[PDB]
């Protein structure tokens, strides 16, 4: 007569700028986008930390600047744009200053377990980037559709 | 305090992130009219709006 | 014999937004967790894991 069939499909493992583990993490609010837009899976820089008030002004990485933290994916604070999720100018940002997060990567080869993380001028991971960080790799290395993702371990500055 | 010298209203819901208010204008005229007339002036109504956070 | 596990996160603002629009997020995340458990059991059966023998 006929032969029945059964199929299978698996979900993806990660998404850009998504918390990877339940380990000890520290997400800092009270940060503002001073200028421009900040992607969910990119590092940020601290333009200025107000003394009396406490708000820290946050921008995108440029040449010769110290990275601070990675943006965090949220369904409420973030604004959907460019067929993606971004943080708009003049809005609060969830910055993770410690923990394990899924970054955006421009490299092509899997990294070692314990080694320094090098970013480029854009703020995305690159195997031979110029900007130097104190963070270390964690091991995860996957890809969501056509986007490459890498896991990093963040240390407080 | 600013919550005593300025009026406080309550319309927004706790789960809102944006709002919008509108204002309207009037455009028209009138004329002295005799009977057996077909030329009557017309009026209209327009408006604009602004936002908040 | 072996043991399995995962987790998920959510905030108060997301809960309030879900209750205010009829589209919860907690249920979707829980279903994703259960689906992940079932699929990893399938992976163990049909492919196994070398380090765990």
């Amino acid at each position: 007569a006929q032969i029945n069939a059964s199929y299978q499909r698996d979900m993806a493992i990660a998404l850009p700028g998504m918390v990877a583990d339940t380990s000890k993490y520290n997400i800092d609010g009270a940060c503002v986008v001073n200028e421009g837009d900040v992607l969910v899976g990119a590092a940020v820089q601290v333009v200025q930390a107000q003394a009396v008030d406490g708000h820290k002004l946050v921008k995108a990485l440029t040449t010769g600047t110290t990275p601070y933290g990675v943006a965090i994916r949220s369904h409420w604070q973030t604004v959907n744009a460019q067929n993606q999720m971004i943080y708009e100018d003049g809005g609060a940002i969830n910055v993770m200053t410690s923990g394990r997060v899924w970054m955006l990567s421009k490299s092509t080869e899997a990294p070692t377990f314990g080694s320094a993380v090098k970013l480029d001028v854009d703020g995305q991971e690159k195997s031979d980037g110029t900007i130097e960080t104190t963070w270390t790799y964690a091991g995860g290395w996957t890809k969501y559709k056509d986007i490459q993702l890498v896991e990093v371990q963040l240390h407080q500055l | 305090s600013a919550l005593r010298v300025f009026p406080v209203t309550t319309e927004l819901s706790p789960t809102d992130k944006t709002f919008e208010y509108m204002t309207f204008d009037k455009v028209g005229t009138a004329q002295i009219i005799a009977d057996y007339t077909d030329d009557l002036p017309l009026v209209d109504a327009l408006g604009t709006s602004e936002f908040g956070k | 014999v072996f043991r399995l596990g995962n987790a998920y996160l959510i905030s108060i603002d997301e809960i309030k937004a879900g209750q205010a629009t009829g589209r919860p997020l907690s249920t979707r995340k829980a279903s994703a967790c259960q689906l992940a458990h079932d699929q990893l059991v399938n992976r163990l059966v049909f492919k196994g894991s070398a380090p765990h023998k």
Binding site: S6, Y7, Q8, R9, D10, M11 | F24, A45, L46, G47, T48, S49 | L35, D38, Q39, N42, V45, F46
Partner: peptide, 28 residues
């Protein structure tokens, strides 16, 4: 300028369908 120059917005005349489609992931 001032666009608008109107009384109704695009949101006020709009509909969101009750049906919602979801991607299917078979288990095995």
């Amino acid at each position: 300028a001032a666009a608008t120059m109107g009384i109704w917005t695009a949101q006020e005349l709009h509909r969101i369908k009750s049906q919602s489609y979801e991607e299917d992931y078979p288990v095995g």
